[PDB]
Amino acid sequence: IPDGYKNEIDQLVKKEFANITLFLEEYRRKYPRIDTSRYIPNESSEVSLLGIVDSYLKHQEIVLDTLLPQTVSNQWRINNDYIRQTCTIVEEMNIQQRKQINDLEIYRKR
Amino acid sequence: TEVLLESIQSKVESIEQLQRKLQHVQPLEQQNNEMC
């Protein structure tokens, strides 16, 4: 009985039981360390010149040189093909485990 | 600051054009992200 004998035996087993890094782990408490929230805002009228040039121009020039297209979609789709080779390998192992698992149960059945 | 206002305008308009054209591979991203 998948509802009586298991419940019965469980009670009998129950009755016999009645008889018988520092920085990382601390951050886990649930707060990430704040980063530099400075570069994005700034102010023309406000304080500090370096922020204008020591924050925005050079990074924007590096951005415009970095922000690209020369290769475009070819570099992306080349990596997409690699992901498909990686995926099929896992499912082949899913099969190999599936066959040997059923094979062991098959021997028990006899 | 005005020089940068020129750059922010010229560079960001090019970045917005480059970004919208690229679209984060948004179809290739979904292709790549759904495979992940």
UniProtKB/Swiss-Prot annotation, chain A:
Organism domain of life: Eukaryota
Q: Which GO terms describe its biological process?
A: mRNA splicing, via spliceosome
Which keywords accompany this UniProt record?
A: mRNA processing, mRNA splicing, Nucleus, Spliceosome
Is ATP-binding there in the keyword field?
A: no
Bilayer-crossing residues are none
Task: Using the UniProt record, give the first listed, main subcellular location.
Answer: nucleus
More details: Present with 721 molecules/cell in log phase SD medium.
Q: What is this protein called?
A: Pre-mRNA-splicing factor SNT309
Q: What is the lineage of its organism?
A: Eukaryota, Fungi, Dikarya, Ascomycota, Saccharomycotina
Gene that this polypeptide is encoded by: SNT309
Curated annotation (Swiss-Prot), chain B:
Q: Identify the domain of life.
A: Eukaryota
Q: Where in the cell is it found?
A: Cytoplasm; Nucleus
Coiled coil where?
none
Instruction: Quote the function comment for this protein.
Output: Involved in pre-mRNA splicing and cell cycle control. Required for the binding of the NTC complex (or PRP19-associated complex) components to the spliceosome to mediate conformational rearrangement or to stabilize the structure of the spliceosome after U4 snRNA dissociation, which leads to spliceosome maturation. Its absence leads to an arrest of the cell cycle, possibly due to the inefficient splicing of TUB1.
Q: What else is known?
A: Present with 784 molecules/cell in log phase SD medium.
Query: Would you identify the family this protein belongs to, as annotated?
Result: Belongs to the CEF1 family.
Quaternary structure, from the entry = Belongs to the NTC complex (or PRP19-associated complex), composed of at least CEF1, CLF1, ISY1, NTC20, SNT309, SYF1, SYF2, and PRP19.
Q: Please state what the protein is called.
A: Pre-mRNA-splicing factor CEF1
As recorded in Swiss-Prot or TrEMBL, the protein's gene is named CEF1
